[PDB]
Amino acid sequence: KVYNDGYDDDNYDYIVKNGEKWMDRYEIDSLIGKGSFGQVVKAYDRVEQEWVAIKIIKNKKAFLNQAQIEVRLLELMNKHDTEMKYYIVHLKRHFMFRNHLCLVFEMLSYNLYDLLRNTNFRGVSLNLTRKFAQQMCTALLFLATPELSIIHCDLKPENILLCNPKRSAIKIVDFGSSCQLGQRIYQYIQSRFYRSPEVLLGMPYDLAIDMWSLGCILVEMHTGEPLFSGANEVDQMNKIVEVLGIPPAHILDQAPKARKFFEKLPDGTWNLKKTKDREYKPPGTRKLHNILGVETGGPGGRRAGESGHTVADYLKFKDLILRMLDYDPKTRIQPYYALQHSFFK
Numbered sequence: 191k192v193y194n195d196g197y198d199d200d201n202y203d204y205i206v207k208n209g210e211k212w213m214d215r216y217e218i219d220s221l222i223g224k225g226s227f228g229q230v231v232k233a234y235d236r237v238e239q240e241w242v243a244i245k246i247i248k249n250k251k252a253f254l255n256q257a258q259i260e261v262r263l264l265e266l267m268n269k270h271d272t273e274m275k276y277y278i279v280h281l282k283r284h285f286m287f288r289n290h291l292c293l294v295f296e297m298l299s300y301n302l303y304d305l306l307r308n309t310n311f312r313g314v315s316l317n318l319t320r321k322f323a324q325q326m327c328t329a330l331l332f333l334a335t336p337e338l339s340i341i342h343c344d345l346k347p348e349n350i351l352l353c354n355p356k357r358s359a360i361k362i363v364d365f366g367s368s369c370q371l372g373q374r375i376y377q378y379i380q381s382r383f384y385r386s387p388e389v390l391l392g393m394p395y396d397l398a399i400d401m402w403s404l405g406c407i408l409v410e411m412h413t414g415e416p417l418f419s420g421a422n423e424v425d426q427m428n429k430i431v432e433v434l435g436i437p438p439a440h441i442l443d444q445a446p447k448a449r450k451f452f453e454k455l456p457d458g459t460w461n462l463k464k465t466k467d468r469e470y471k472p473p474g475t476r477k478l479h480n481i482l483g484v485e486t487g488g489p490g491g492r493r494a495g496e497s498g499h500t501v502a503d504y505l506k507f508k509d510l511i512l513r514m515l516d517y518d519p520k521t522r523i524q525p526y527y528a529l530q531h532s533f534f535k
């Protein structure tokens with residue numbers, strides 16, 4: 191039995207062959223990534239003499255349709271970013287090849303997990319975190335351009351790639367999960383560790399959900415470890431609550447899924463639910479002040495007396511993160527204002 195004249199496996203994926211040449215132009219090197227959508231391969235573009243990443247979408251209508259939306263968002267961004275100055279990997283071109291949609295990007299070689307793994311998950315410096323944070327806030331600034339109003343919806347270390355000159359810069363990839371404000375209203379979205387309270391609570395959401403993800407990611411960049419590593423949605427919300435306390439009553443009163451996590455008392459206040467069975471630190475007592483080590487030399491005490499890691503520096507970082515982790519999406523800090531924060535001065 192053959193699929194797509196022998197080009198596909200039994201799962202609608204193009205059968206990648208190291209060394210194959212596509213259209214006398216792309217010399218396929220190796221598989222670099224894979225997922226439900228298809229595959230990403232490393233290839234050498236002989237015409238432009240440069241390494242590229244090619245995202246090969248499955249020969250399957252559902253994934254083709256998803257990726258056609260992705261292409262339209264990338265092309266929209268290209269129309270607003272002729273200088274490629276916003277830390278988003280640029281779509282160079284797209285084409286159909288043997289019944290697969292192919293998106294071609296400049297080739298980057300590492301993600302943020304790779305960088306953290308090289309620190310043995312001890313985290314990078316506050317100085318490097320500051321540079322990456324400014325770059326990510328600049329990307330979010332661009333996405334909130336009114337005509338764009340793009341919600342990435344899947345910010346996580348795997349979708350943040352490193353630029354080849356090392357410690358210079360990161361760039362965002364994977365807009366296959368993204369939508370525009372008021373175009374898709376899917377409810378179980380974001381990667382769980384980076385999932386905002388509004389999404390957990392089943393409430394309406396906007397571009398502020400990406401700023402929540404970014405706050406979580408920035409803490410993880412500096413500490414080496416995920417801030418909120420929930421094994422399921424209840425564990426996820428409970429780990430958020432350990433750090434930030436019970437969400438405001440005016441939010442829980444409007445939340446479809448409030449009762450998945452909390453119970454309203456006759457007093458009108460909200461508490462965590464309890465179970466006949468896990469055990470959590472009391473609400474708000476796992477202080478970000480101590481996660482970051484503001485007064486104790488940073489994470490693990492490893493930054494004691496290091497330039498750019500003074501108590502004053504840590505207090506500005508802590509303040510920015512808490513502004514990104516505001517429970518209220520209407521008052522959570524927005525990209526332009528984050529970029530004006532004293533942490534970046």
Ligand SMILES: CCN1CCN(Cc2ccc(Nc3ncc(F)c(-c4cc(F)c5nc(C)n(C(C)C)c5c4)n3)nc2)CC1
Nearest residue numbers: 222223230243245279295296297298299300301348363364
């Ligand atoms: C077990 C981990 N293995 C080995 C380590 N490896 C890290 C890694 C990841 C990516 C690259 N290279 C690269 N360069 C430019 C690009 F634009 C994309 C790109 C574009 C897209 F549109 C994507 N859409 C999705 C879903 N992905 C995912 C693959 C992130 C996209 C990636 N990728 N190099 C290394 C991961 C796999």
